Amino acid sequence: AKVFGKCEFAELLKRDYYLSNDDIKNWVCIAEFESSFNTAAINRNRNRSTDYGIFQINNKYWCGSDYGKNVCKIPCSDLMSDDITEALRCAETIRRDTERFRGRGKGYSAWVAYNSKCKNRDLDQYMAECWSH
Distances (CA, A) of 13 to 7, 23, 100, 119: 10, 9, 24, 20
Which experimental approach was used here? X-ray
Neighbouring-strand partners of residue 125? none
Mutual angle of helices 6-17 and 21-35, in 10-degree steps:
140
Q: Name which of 95, 94, 97, 115 is nearest 107 in CA terms.
A: 95
- Please report the resolution in angstroms: 3.0
**Active site residues per annotation:** 34, 51
Q: Name which of 133, 131, 112 is nearest 29 in CA terms.
A: 112
Q: Fold for 1-133, please state it.
A: Lysozyme (1.10.530)
Give the H/E segment covering residue 27.
helix 21-35
Q: Name which of 85, 101, 89, 107 is nearest 12 in CA terms.
A: 85
Cα–Cα distance, 96 to 90 (Å, whole number): 10
Task: Give the start-to-end residue ranges of the domains of the chain.
Answer: 1-133
